[PDB]
Amino acid sequence: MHGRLKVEAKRLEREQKLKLYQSATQAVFQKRQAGELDESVLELTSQILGANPDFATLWNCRREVLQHLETEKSPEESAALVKAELGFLESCLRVNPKSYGTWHHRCWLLSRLPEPNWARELELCARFLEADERNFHCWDYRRFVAAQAAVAPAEELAFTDSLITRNFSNYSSWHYRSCLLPQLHPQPRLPENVLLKELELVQNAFFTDPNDQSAWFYHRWLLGAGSGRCELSVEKSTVLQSELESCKELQELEPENKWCLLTIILLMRALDPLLYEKETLQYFSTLKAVDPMRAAYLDDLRSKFLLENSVLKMEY
């Protein structure tokens, strides 16, 4: 268990919750061994799964009941049970939106239906992502729904844009963009025009909020996702040099910002390792003073880059 702060009637209330939970659990298992796959099981498990959605066996019992009732109920009665189940799932998700069991039961349920309302499931996603934009369960469910409904990469890309601009907490939405972009193109590395548009979007982000670590992580990826030094186009070379000078300006505004310093080093690598060897080494020293916890990593990176440089000088 996570997040339980340490600090009679509080002790008593849960003493009474337990005996109810225990008797309800007792009752469920008795019915199950008796082969009573009926509505009373759904009533009993609803009482338990509300507070304790990680009790996986009880989700399995709900599924066994639903399967069994479907064979011996009418189509209209079966439909009614399904809608009741969706209501129950939504109320469970309101209480605990980060349980594997609940999200999976919803997928199981939706995967059985002809015909599910996927537009509505996508809206449910957007609501939960408004509450917590990093809920990976919800992003996973959205990817499941999008595939089911065959929503196109372009639509999902448009969704990620609004999310990134309306506020921070963007790591999950940048991650989604990194999977969407290669699909839009794709290949058996991003095309330069795409790459240049993304760089513009990401540099907006980390100048708008320089503490936003997600934009810096995504930017490091973009830097490696191109056709390479040195088939640097005139436009890419100009863009990167421009990014270099904007990072130095930001370094002036935010002198304890480690991300800007690391990015300068990476840009110089992307531009011309040997021409910038002196400056690269100066930046490593500044960076280690600013981010001492990463000193071992930074020394190893610098060692890698120094080897690269020796290899470049020897190809003369």
Binding site: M1, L5, L18, D54, N60, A296
Partner: protein, 325 residues
């Protein structure tokens, strides 16, 4: 930015005696214990492993555990968390780990365990956790870890399993639950553990992933599971074990992390909590102590970064996957 601030009266000493007493007495009654029965087998694994890392396994109830495990194996070969509950890969792994600690694998039907695991593999190489079909890289790791410990890795389609796991690798070097899922330290441990067992660590970008992992360390010294979240002592396992597997453990500030972990101990009750001042539990007690072993703490047995069990146990069963370093 999100981080805890450690108090200057936080424990700065390792309280093994208190932790062994805490675990030895755990489940002597009880709300949280009863509410968590759905994971009991894994709960038993956490307690026994941490006691064995501290040299105190003898204080637990061997004979009683062996009977409990046998009663949890279902006719299909899979093992459940507790009696009456349904079988699952998670608890199948935990049971096999326990039996491995006790050198009592004969207690269950091994041929049937193998058949169960084999049966949960899908056409794309993934594993479902049970018959209801939830797919997660967690379950890929559970399947190959179970099989490796039984000497039966050849029982599954390993190349397809590898392909599925590599399809879960992300732009940042990490892994998620399924293809397209965001990187998270827990999944990263499962997938790097999977790749160690199947001999595919050369397919990991160790420098990129290692950087992402060492950036989990916050100014407090503690580690988070992904960007912009709070530190949690169980990341001392998930993040460090991954780093160790990929040969980048030195990319962490060892002394700052060690101070964070020790500050998560309860000096009164023993055990570790997820963060200082929270309530302790057996789960965070294992992962805190295991995290310290990985950092070279002398009072604790060396721990396998892949299997989260004492290395001496794995030496005995001759299953020690090669790491990057």
């Amino acid at each position: 930015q999100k981080d805890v601030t450690i108090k200057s009266d936080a424990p700065d000493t390792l309280l093994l005696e208190k932790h062994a007493d805490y675990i030895a007495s755990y489940g002597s009654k009880d709300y949280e214990y009863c509410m968590s029965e759905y994971l009991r087998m894994s709960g038993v694994y956490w307690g026994l492993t941490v006691m064995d890392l501290m040299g105190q396994l003898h204080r637990m109830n061997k004979e009683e555990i062996l009977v409990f495990i046998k009663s949890c194996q279902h006719e299909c070969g899979g093992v459940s968390a507790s009696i009456g509950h349904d079988p699952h890969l998670l608890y199948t792994l935990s049971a096999v780990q326990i039996l491995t600690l006790y050198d009592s694998i004969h207690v269950i039907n091994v041929d049937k365990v193998v058949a169960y695991v084999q049966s949960l593999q899908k056409e794309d190489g993934s594993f479902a956790g049970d018959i209801w079909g939830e797919i997660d890289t967690r379950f890929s790791f559970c399947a190959v870890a179970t099989l490796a410990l039984l000497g039966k890795l050849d029982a599954i389609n390993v190349e397809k399993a590898i392909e599925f796991v590599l399809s879960c690798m992300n732009f940042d070097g990490g892994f998620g639950c399924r293809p397209g899922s965001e990187s998270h330290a827990g999944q990263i441990y499962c997938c790097t553990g999977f790749l160690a067992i199947t001999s595919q660590l050369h397919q990991v970008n160790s420098d990129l992933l290692g950087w992402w992992l060492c950036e989990r360390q916050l100014p407090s010294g503690g580690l988070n599971g992904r960007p912009e979240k709070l530190p949690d002592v169980c990341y001392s396992w998930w993040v460090l074990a991954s780093l160790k597997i990929i040969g980048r453990l030195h990319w962490i500030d060892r002394e700052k992390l060690r101070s964070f972990i020790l500050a998560c101990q309860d000096e009164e009750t023993g055990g570790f909590a997820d963060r200082p001042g929270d309530m302790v539990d057996p789960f965070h007690t294992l992962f805190g102590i295991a995290g310290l072993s990985l950092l070279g703490e002398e009072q604790i047995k060396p721990v396998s970064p892949v299997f989260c069990m004492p290395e001496e146990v794995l030496q005995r069963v001759n299953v020690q996957p090669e790491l990057v370093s």
